[PDB]
Design a protein around this ligand. Sequence first.
Ligand code: HEM
Ligand code: HEM
Ligand SMILES: *[C@@H]1O[C@H](CO)[C@@H](O[C@@H]2O[C@H](CO)[C@@H](O[C@@H]3O[C@H](CO)[C@@H](O)[C@H](O)[C@@H]3O)[C@H](O)[C@H]2NC(C)=O)[C@H](O)[C@H]1NC(C)=O
Ligand SMILES: *[C@@H]1O[C@H](CO)[C@@H](O[C@@H]2O[C@H](CO)[C@@H](O[C@@H]3O[C@H](CO)[C@@H](O)[C@H](O)[C@@H]3O)[C@H](O)[C@H]2NC(C)=O)[C@H](O)[C@H]1NC(C)=O
Lengths: 186, 186
Amino acid sequence: QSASQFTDPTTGFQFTGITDPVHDVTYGFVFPPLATSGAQSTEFIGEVVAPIASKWIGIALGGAMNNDLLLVAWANGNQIVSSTRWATGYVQPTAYTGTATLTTLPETTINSTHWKWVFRCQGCTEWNNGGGIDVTSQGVLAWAFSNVAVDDPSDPQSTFSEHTDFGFFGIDYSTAHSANYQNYLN
Amino acid sequence: QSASQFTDPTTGFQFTGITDPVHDVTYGFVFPPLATSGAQSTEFIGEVVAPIASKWIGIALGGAMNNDLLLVAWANGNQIVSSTRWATGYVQPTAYTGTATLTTLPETTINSTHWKWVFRCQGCTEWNNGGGIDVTSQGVLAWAFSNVAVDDPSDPQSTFSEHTDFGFFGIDYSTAHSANYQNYLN
Ligand code: HEM
Ligand code: HEM
Ligand SMILES: *[C@@H]1O[C@H](CO)[C@@H](O[C@@H]2O[C@H](CO)[C@@H](O[C@@H]3O[C@H](CO)[C@@H](O)[C@H](O)[C@@H]3O)[C@H](O)[C@H]2NC(C)=O)[C@H](O)[C@H]1NC(C)=O
Ligand SMILES: *[C@@H]1O[C@H](CO)[C@@H](O[C@@H]2O[C@H](CO)[C@@H](O[C@@H]3O[C@H](CO)[C@@H](O)[C@H](O)[C@@H]3O)[C@H](O)[C@H]2NC(C)=O)[C@H](O)[C@H]1NC(C)=O
């Protein structure tokens, strides 16, 4: 599948991403302005907009399950629980051992039909194995879905069962940068 | 997703299609030679190679659930049960009333781990609603998956529940024809 640009109707944030029509989960990404005289930033802002039957969602930032930074999140009541994780094989991803900061932004909403996680991901484009994403080029992102609750929803490091679906989408990161990035943070 | 050309390693048939990595079902299509002179053929050969946990599979020949010819099939023991269907709104597709003949070809194989349905679809590029597929152009195909058994597996017109997954792929019909099509038939 292929990402495209879209606007959050509540916030007006402008993202690049997709809506999976099966689970009707929206995934959106936006990056700071491209630098020419300095190295690129290592942070980005993203969103997951998920129907409440979505019990956990994961994002694979390198487009595959293994050896890339993963983001995992779920609703637990009126709060999002989230974590940065990693998998070396096809088994339970565990806490990421590098430096990465996931911040839930206040635009994050939970209501009766959907949870909407809006986050800041710092240190998420370069990983502690030397891998990462190139925000000036084209890449692939992937997502994981489950409709089964995590084993212990109040724990960010909870274990859980294999996703019931997963998918991919191509993204041209060179088009996903925004001059309004700073304002989104504010 | 995008289709590519591949060869069936047992039969040697050359198909254009994809493998869905979630349910590990392969969808392949091959068309008779394009005509330079006159109307195109209205038939094609296809295959579904599915793990036996796949309880029913559907193919949407127009790339959508509604207003296009649908093919539905499942394993019932050591036989494939299949039918042509049509959907009026997002409800249980019913028997197609147009001109289309679905034939199970002798290459069809069912074993302990997979069912491989190889079929001939005559009259399937033009539908009795006046719609159809343009075999000289680029189009979209879709598939539907369930891991739950149909309500009556011995009935080709069995009712069944909503698919648990569905997906799409782009296909360049202009490169999906084969000079060996007639040999596939004999
Ligand atoms: C206990 C939890 C997990 C288990 C046991 C697991 C298991 C697996 C297995 C067996 C596959 C191969 C499926 C196929 O190709 O047929 C797979 C693929 C995949 N998994 Fe997971 N997974 C889990 C958690 C996660 C999480 C949390 C994410 C994302 C944050 C994820 C993302 C992926 C992706 C995107 C793929 C497809 C691409 C690939 O083959 O690398 N998985 N997983
Ligand atoms: C009793 C059986 C069925 C029911 C109740 C049903 C229901 C639905 C529903 C509600 C959707 C919309 C999903 C969404 O976008 O979230 C849909 C989508 C779709 N269905 Fe079905 N379906 C059934 C059988 C089939 C069959 C047999 C096929 C193919 C042979 C099929 C192909 C598709 C496809 C391709 C889509 C996505 C594209 C589009 O929205 O038309 N469905 N179905
Ligand atoms: C619970 O959260 C969800 C997700 O944010 C809310 O649904 C979203 O609500 C917005 C605002 O109405 C929808 O945007 C609107 O879209 C329509 C259709 O094009 C357009 O006519 C409006 O002008 C506006 O742009 C958005 O589509 C919708 N998203 C989803 C996934 O449902 C929902 O409203 C929240 N529930 C409550 C009770 O507040
Ligand atoms: C039941 O039928 C399925 C589908 O035909 C069998 O799986 C298929 O087995 C063939 C081998 O005859 C595989 O082709 C081989 O692939 C390997 C690796 O790519 C290659 O080295 C060989 O030269 C040959 O091309 C094919 O990949 C495989 N397809 C799938 C979807 O698994 C299955 O083995 C049969 N089961 C039993 C118990 O007979």
